[PDB]
């Protein structure tokens, strides 16, 4: 019953005696005095000094005629007799950057999650995420002004839906004061940033996404305490939200009530269908060793923060009980055990983990010159080995395209034509490899310079006639749309059944072949030739003979590939290859991957 602090704390419309006003409550149990100051009383806190309930530590007071729209603050004298104003930790709407004051409105209406959105999160579901930072995806050209939440509905959602993505993941939209944090250093946890409009424009924007068939993942930030002025730091003159840099005292009921509630709020009150936490490693460790001693099983040097580890665990359980169908995802880098394993098994309790190791391993490989990929087969092949230890998302995130890491396009080897060929052949490996898929805005049309959180994306790359960039984009649209159609590509991602090697070592040629199969037993053959060399009459074993039809060739004219493929429907011919009792002779185009389906 303390899992929706937001439903009662903060500032909410109420009616007393039949006189409309607004009701104010703030948790500040070591204050000597609290007052609401606002427009309604000309920022004079003498007028409306609040009332303390010693039992709970909450200050209360109802102001008549105070209506939503009007800015306010809490002016307290803290526990030590100092004087400061505080912004509402439960501000649902806030002034913009330097202004930093809370606007009064209430909760939006609860949003009920459809059976359709709930199926889209499930492990058997095709899950292709399109990751976006709203502040830098497009801009108005003349102004270089931000697209509003409302303009983002007009543009982003038709564009995400068009491209065939399944989900839409936004970098944090909690209110924060500086752009370059990207939103991962917040101030107002319950307020969507005013950059792009009002709280209800945000609503209108996710409602619009919903209506177009997209789920919305939201980067959630319980890991980074709010360091700035008016934040929570030393909230009532004591260390209230924080511990004696700065970490939340998660062990304290009201703080967990604050943060677990934040999750329910975003899910229940805006209809967000999934939350992700960046940098769990930061949250669950700390720089210094415990110093009480060594009561440490899973040796981590005793810098583990158990208090925080219980928090993630407890949050996942509550989110399971209370809002089933919404899910949570994590990115953790210390190889911590079982971030995506059930809490009961002792895991963190997250549903999917970002597969940072597979992204590191593949890009390195793809980085290399095609003439050396013979000596590094392991980076493609060892991926499957660890796959069944987590429920993985193949990332290609915003973090991999910034700060001196070249764009994903810049890492490819070739002379121009080569250079795009890798990408087209890469993506079609990625989409065929076990795991859900996440891709960051810009990668889809093979942008060339790094992402600039301070600028629109180089959309101009797609002005002009069909070119290399139109080809990466169109391929991706096909990868998705074919990915979504074939149960094989997504049903058994986490079952050893769903994947089987057909050619783990043909190392010299750098050729790799495997299949993905669903629960019925239908298979899809995928073939990648990671060397610029074309390959004809290539032969290898199959489990199922019959008619095989090329459903996607990475190399085709539309993607500005060679356009040279196998031709038409291929029929299996009995020859002995790899002891499978059936073999195929195929064209392995140059720097391209191939996908085959078997015609009945
Ligand atoms: O050499 C001269 C000059 O060059 C440089 O200035 C360039 C900027 O540095 C550079 O950023 C680029 O600015 C880009 C911008 O970064 C990028 O986001 C992109 O803008 C897109 C919009 O996002 C997109 O919407 C579309 O705009 C639409 C709009 O959505 C729609 O509502 C309607 O208004 O139609 C618009 C199109 O007309 O497309 C644009 C671009 O295609 O592109 C920007 C480029 O304009 O380019 C600047 C020009 O050089 C150097 O920085 C400077 O030192 C040099 O003096
Ligand atoms: O231009 C826009 C285009 O959009 C739509 O076409 C898309 C298709 O709907 C979609 O299936 C996909 O087409 C793929 C195709 O699936 C894939 O097999 C591959 O086609 C290869 C052949 O496999 C290969 O044999 C070779 O064709 C040879 C042929 O064998 C030979 O007998 C002789 O005819 O020479 C041919 C040379 O082309 O190469 C082709 C490559 O085209 O790649 C296709 C393109 O990706 O994607 C299509 C484009 O998005 C609409 O259906 C269509 O009306 C529109 O024109
Ligand atoms: O429309 C009048 C005025 O609006 C804006 O100024 C207001 C601020 O936006 C608002 O935050 C508030 O400022 C208070 C601070 O938050 C608080 O820390 C302390 O300094 O008390 C202030 C109020 O005295 O109120 C002001 C206006 O009173 C806008 O920025 C102005 O351009 C505009 O003139
Ligand atoms: O033609 C390139 C074009 O593709 C997409 O435009 C879509 C549009 O989003 C849909 O609403 C519908 O009209 O189909 C169009 C393509 O046929 C992209 O949205 C757009 O950026 C791009 O220029
Ligand atoms: O000056 C560079 C940038 O610094 C910070 O990101 C500020 O929030 C932003 O307003 C400014 O443009
Ligand atoms: O720096 C950006 C450039 O990187 C590489 O040169 C790409 O080939 C080119 O397309 C892109 O414009
Ligand atoms: O498949 C033919 C290809 O051979 C090589 O990759 C060339 O670099 C490229 O220009 C050509 O298109």
Residue numbers in the entry: 117 to 360, 372 to 727
Give sentences from the paper.
Glycogen is the primary storage polysaccharide in bacteria and animals. It is a glucose polymer linked by α-1,4 glucose linkages and branched via α-1,6-linkages, with the latter reaction catalyzed by branching enzymes. In the third step, catalyzed by the branching enzyme (BE), an alpha-1,4 linkage is cleaved, and its reducing end is reattached to make α-1,6 branch points on the polymer. All of the structures have in common a carbohydrate binding module 48 (CBM48) domain n-terminal to the canonical (βα)8 TIM barrel catalytic domain common to all GH13 enzymes and a c-terminal β-sandwich domain common to a number of GH13 enzymes, including the α-amylases, isoamylases, and a number of others.
Herein, we report the structure of M8-bound EcBE, which, to our surprise, identified an additional five new surface glucan binding sites, creating a large glucan surface concentrated on one side of the enzyme. As was the case for all previous malto-oligosaccharide-bound EcBE structures, EcBE with its N-domain removed (the first 113 amino acids of full-length EcBE) was used for crystallization, and soaking these previously grown crystals in high concentrations of M8 was the only path to diffraction-quality M8-bound EcBE crystals. A new EcBE crystal form was used in this case, which has different crystal packing interactions, possibly freeing other regions of the molecule for sugar binding. As was the case for previous structures, there are four unique molecules in the asymmetric unit that provide additional possibilities for sugars to bind without destroying the lattice. However, probably due to the large number of binding sites available on each EcBE molecule, resolution was significantly compromised by M8 soaking, giving a structure of relatively low resolution (3.0 Å). Binding in the five previously identified sites was relatively similar to that seen in the M7-bound EcBE structure for most of the sites, though more glucose units were seen in most of the five sites (compare the 4, 2, 2, 2, and 2 glucose units seen in sites I–V in the M7-bound EcBE structure to the 7, 2, 1, 4, and 3 glucose units seen in the M8-bound EcBE structure). However, M8 binding in site I is quite different from that seen in the M7-bound structure. As shown, three glucose units, not seen in the M7-bound structure, wrap around the 247–264 loop (which connects β1 and α1 of the (α,β)8 central catalytic TIM barrel domain), ending at the entrance to site VII, suggesting that an even longer glucan would span sites I and VII. Remembering that sites I and VII are conserved in only enterobacterial enzymes and the preference of these enzymes for the transfer of longer glucans, it is reasonable to hypothesize that binding from the active site to sites I and VII would provide a binding surface for such longer transferred glucans.
